[PDB]
Amino acid sequence: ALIGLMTYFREAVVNTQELLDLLVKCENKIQTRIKIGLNSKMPSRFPPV
RNA sequence: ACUCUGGUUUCUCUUCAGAUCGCAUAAAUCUUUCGCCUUUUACUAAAGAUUUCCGUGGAGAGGAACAACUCUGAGUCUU
DSSP states (O other): OHHHHHHHHSSHHHHOHHHHHHHHHHHHHHHHHHHHHHOSSOOSSOOOO
C-alpha cells in the first residue's frame, strides 16, 4: 500500500503535510500491532532492527 | 419621667434552600466533541447533564447552660 501511494504521487506527498503525519501514524500502528503480537505488554525501547 | 415587656449561649432532631448555600472549591458517573490510542482500570481537555463529598443559611421542634433580672419597644412618659 505504501509503495503504491508513494510511487503514484511522488511529488504531492511533500506538500501535503497532513499526509506525512498520516503515513507515520499508520507505520506506528503497524509496528504497534506487531509488538502486541509479540507480547501483550508493550515494550519501552523497541529497536528498529 | 413611669409599669409590663423574659433573654443569650450551647447540644441535638426535622425540614426548606432561591442566594457567591461556599467572597472557597474536589471527586465520580453518563452523554457528546477531541488528544493518546493497545485492553480494561487509570487518562489528554473542553462542553452538557447528573451523583457523591467537604462545608453553609433560614425556619420549626426537643433538652441543657439560665439564673433573670431586665435590655427593648409598646404608653400618656411625670414635674
